[PDB]
Amino acid sequence: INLNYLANVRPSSRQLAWQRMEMYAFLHFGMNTMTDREWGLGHEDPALFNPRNVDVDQWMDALVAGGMAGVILTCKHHDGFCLWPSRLTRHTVASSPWREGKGDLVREVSESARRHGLKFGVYLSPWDRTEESYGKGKAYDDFYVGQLTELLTQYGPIFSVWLAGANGEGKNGKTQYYDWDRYYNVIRSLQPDAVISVCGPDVRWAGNAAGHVRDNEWSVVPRRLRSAELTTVSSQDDDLGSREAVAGYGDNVCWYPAEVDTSIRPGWFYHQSEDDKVMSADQLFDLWLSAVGGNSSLLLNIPPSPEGLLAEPDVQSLKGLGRRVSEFREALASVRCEARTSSASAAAAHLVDGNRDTFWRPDADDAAPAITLTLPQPTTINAIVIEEAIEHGQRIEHLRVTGALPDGTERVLGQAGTVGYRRILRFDDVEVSSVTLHVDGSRLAPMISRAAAVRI
Amino acid sequence: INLNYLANVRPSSRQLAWQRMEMYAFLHFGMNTMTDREWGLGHEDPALFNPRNVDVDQWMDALVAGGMAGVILTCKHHDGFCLWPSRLTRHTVASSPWREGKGDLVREVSESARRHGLKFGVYLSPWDRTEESYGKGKAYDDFYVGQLTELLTQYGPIFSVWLAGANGEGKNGKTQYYDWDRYYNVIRSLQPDAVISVCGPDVRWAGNAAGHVRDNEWSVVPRRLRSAELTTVSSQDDDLGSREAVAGYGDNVCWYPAEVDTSIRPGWFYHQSEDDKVMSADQLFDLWLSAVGGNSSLLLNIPPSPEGLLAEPDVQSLKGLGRRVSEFREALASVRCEARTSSASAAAAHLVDGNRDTFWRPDADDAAPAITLTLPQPTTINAIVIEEAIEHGQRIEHLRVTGALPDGTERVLGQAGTVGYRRILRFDDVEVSSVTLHVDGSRLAPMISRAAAVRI
């Protein structure tokens, strides 16, 4: 096991810009919304696509109020109907009566995303149930690549290209062997800042669709994980990144951080029968604390109705999720403790200076690295937040948190494994004088760019 | 030919940062210096490595004076002797009398480069005439990855990893092949910002070691060039990227810009007999004008002597080189021209603000994109300098430049094909009132971040 190797695997600059987005939105919309399905059958009549009240500004307003950093639109789902006027097939909005055949929903969405300060990403299903070339090999690749080129060069900066693994062809279906390597070269060449996700090397599907977050989430994982979703370790395993899980891989490991994806409803597309099963503001806020406080990026889907609007319950939950995240952020930014450290005290101000590029790192011979955060007055708290300077790698393996009570006893307030981008370690309301964070397990010396004790 | 794909192939942000360096130094130094050889045989006595006056600060001052942005050290050449105390072999400085076995020349160079404002890069020869694992396959990959690991984690940020492709049979009669893809994973994981050069995807050997520069240099080229150093295309071919040369490749092309490498002496390592064969300031400045005015990076090797200093003639030529370059940059930044454009006047000021991140692009239906630069007084000029916003791709195919003389007549000054990072287009001295740059061939609308008219 070479810890100078493991402890120094680092995010690319596109991975690090992505990680700081934290939470962004999925928008599953199109033919499936019109036909009320989760998967379409292919060859749907384009006359079915006639939403009478498409209001992307209403979607974006609600995503801004929800604290979203960007939006990923389903520009072509498995059914093959394209939401832009592709020159490569007639199975698009141009063949539909929406906007008299002059519409381009990718343009409307990306333009409105930008006006509202949200990044824009594209979902482009490799699986296609309409396209005649699908199953033919190379001729389908050329079609796909030609569609990537349209999406990546006509609509401005793309932050994510999301490549779904789903394939329902079955034992007797069409067999298409995607030329993934040729697709990557296209994406890298045209949008080199974009992250290629799921069936791609930059961002890893966390391995469930229900919003479950691992107890420990390693961004440093075996390199074969980048092929997991493509065609025996699996995106689903609970343990991917522990010393024990990675040792036999040696250098054949990489930075490949997790994205937790889930829908606000049981389905990805809008179904009216799901209006009473829309996740609430607090269930969403809990998901957020859990994911964004658990080294996991959060991709939350909110499907527009066939009228072409986000439904009321969904807008209410998003408004409420954004109020909560925004009070959290406000709390973190305005708390004020004095920080003391077990060693390298000259750098203790880095833990509390509001600067994500400065960090504290204990001397290499410090046998028990610890941070103590002393509150200006005795205070009721119920979380600590801690961040690693993940530019420099992911190190922390165990963290134990203790609290000094005003009577002068101390309680073990809670423990966690991995930190990474951010750990929000939650516990019961408790009034304390100070907290100590015992970083008692690490892969070489940890680099900690923020620490705070907070009341959520 | 798909122009919508070609005109939109772009550099990664790491290739973009490397391009802004322009010129940086090679330092070939080590066992071969001590035995006065261009190639070592392997198994050299480590007592031979005993330079008496290693003074890397003296190297770095001379390189700063020469205008270099960085330096790339041969941390191990083909002979196999390591300039740092590697844990994977005893064929290193730890076995030599240099600093009584306690030296690390890699540490000395990288720390001095950093003090001097210079980036640091490493050359680590895959070919190894000493290492006993060479020729055994995976076991030599293990070794090599192990040494790459030391170099990429122990010495701060690395701007380039420069990989030469040569191979040989080992002491077992068998040829070593290299697990390239495995090496790239190491480099990408530990130093995400580094460019992997020559035998690597990010930076292309220009195809000669004589300082020759193509008339037209395309950074958009067939993707197979990335394997050329690992009729077929060669790195040496004159035409790699014209519409004719790339047409057949469709999207299997990429951003792979040229690096022109050459030595300030006939050999790469120092030889006392070559002290009277050091290229002069003027030769080196014509080389700079040619490469850095021809969309090529310049990598200039200056080898330290067996006593451990850059020799006087080398220092002197560096000094004069740096002076001419600095006069060039003065002429570039002190001309006060008014810029007018054939379309999109609102963006004209982007031509002259000295900012590489703003550019002018003519209207979609401007049929004759042109820039006229008006001098404050009739002035003698003998070059134009033009730079494309290469962040967005490389598009210019032909440029024609005319001059307006004070007597109201017009002269055709010169023409050039490619531009890329920068074209310096020189021509017979002439006094003009203004000059016009007619971009009369381009892959879609050109994007130009600087245009100037100068006296060199």
Ligand SMILES: CC(=O)N[C@@H]1[C@@H](O[C@@H]2O[C@H](CO)[C@H](O)[C@H](O)[C@H]2O)[C@H](O[C@@H]2O[C@@H](C)[C@@H](O)[C@@H](O)[C@@H]2O)[C@@H](CO)O[C@H]1O
């Ligand atoms: C194991 C599993 O969840 N399988 C099917 C889903 O596909 C996986 O989806 C995830 C993303 O959650 C990832 O791409 C894997 O590579 C796929 O195998 C499937 O969901 C698909 O992804 C959704 C985001 C959505 O676009 C959906 O329409 C798409 O088919 C779901 C469909 O409900 O079925 C799973 O059984």
Ligand SMILES: CC(=O)N[C@@H]1[C@@H](O[C@@H]2O[C@H](CO)[C@H](O)[C@H](O)[C@H]2O)[C@H](O[C@@H]2O[C@@H](C)[C@@H](O)[C@@H](O)[C@@H]2O)[C@@H](CO)O[C@H]1O
């Ligand atoms: C085609 C050629 O020049 N081959 C031999 C050189 O190798 C090429 O070096 C260039 C860089 O100029 C590039 O890596 C190619 O892929 C190599 O094939 C060879 O030079 C090697 O490169 C120098 C930078 C230097 O480090 C040298 O020691 C090393 O051998 C030279 C040796 O002089 O011979 C060529 O015939």
Ligand code: NA
């Ligand atoms: Na900080």
Ligand code: NA
């Ligand atoms: Na500019």
